[PDB]
A = this chain, B = another copy of it.
Amino acid sequence: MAATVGPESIWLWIGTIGMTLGTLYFVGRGRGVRDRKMQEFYIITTFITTIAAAMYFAMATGFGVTEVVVGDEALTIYWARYADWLFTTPLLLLDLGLLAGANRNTIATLIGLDVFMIGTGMIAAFAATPGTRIAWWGISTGALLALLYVLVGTLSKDARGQSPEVASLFGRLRNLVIVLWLLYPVVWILGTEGTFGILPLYWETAAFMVLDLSAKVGFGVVLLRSRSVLRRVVTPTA
């Protein structure tokens, strides 16, 4: 590590604040749910925001930062982003999976692709060459496309077998994931990590802040909005 933060810390704190607020919202919002199913959604969702909050606090306090050397240039890498995504992105897919009524093979595929995506993603963040970093960015992006392919394909088909409100709910959440998630690689390739520095680290941090907040608190908020629709994921009594 041994890297100082910078003016971007403003976004890091807003992010930390937002994630912490979403968590408390979901904790109180989840208060009183007895249905074992509705609860899953609250647990998964709540863990997504608190993890994100802790990592944002890590980058804010300067813990989740480091300096990576690449071609007579020292890039500033906020690695905590990966420790965050490594856990939160698969959970988000879990949410979608459970929402769509998908089976373990599909959900396992999604999780597997996702982890491969963040893993090759952090390799890219630390690679020692503009060529190597972009190669890895390329591997990781490929995986993103492979999992998005599962979302619009098999997963979408599963959701169509769900009650209409659930299917609708899925559609929204799926489309949110598609637009938001595709933006991450773009912000990365343009930002500091891509070695091209087209998008200043200050604005890159902000971009990731808006994305993370929308992909987690926003996502969670529309997911857990209605309790009755969410319990249509299952019909029988228990």
Could you tell me which A residues sit within 8 Å of B by CB distance?
Answer: 36, 39-40, 43, 47, 50-51, 54, 57-58, 61-63, 103, 105, 108-109, 112, 116, 119-120, 123, 126-129, 132, 135, 139
Are the C-beta atoms of B109 and A54 separated by less than 8 Å?
no
- CB of A128 within 8 A of CB of B54, answer no
Contact A132 B36 (CB under 8 A): no
Chain B, residue nearest A135 (CB): B61
Q: With A51-B116, A54-B120, A116-B54 as known contacts, state yes or no: A63 contacts B126, CB within 8 Å.
A: yes
Number of copies: 3
Docked Cα-Cα span, A62 to B54, in Å, equals: 30
Could you tell me if B108 and A43 are in contact, using CB atoms closer than 8 angstroms? yes
CA A58 to CA B136, docked complex, whole Å: 9
Other 19 A-B pairs with CB < 8 A, given A43-B108, A54-B139, A63-B123: A36-B105, A39-B105, A40-B105, A43-B105, A43-B109, A43-B112, A47-B116, A54-B116, A54-B119, A54-B120, A57-B139, A58-B123, A61-B127, A61-B132, A61-B135, A62-B128, A63-B126, A63-B128, A63-B132
Interchain residue pairs with CB less than 8 A apart (22):
A36-B103, A36-B105, A39-B105, A40-B105, A43-B105, A43-B108, A43-B112, A47-B112, A47-B116, A50-B116, A51-B116, A54-B116, A54-B123, A54-B139, A57-B139, A61-B127, A61-B129, A61-B132, A61-B135, A62-B128, A63-B127, A63-B128
Q: How far is the CA of A162 from the CA of B47 in the complex (A)?
A: 29
A62 / chain B contacts, CB cutoff of 8 Å: 128
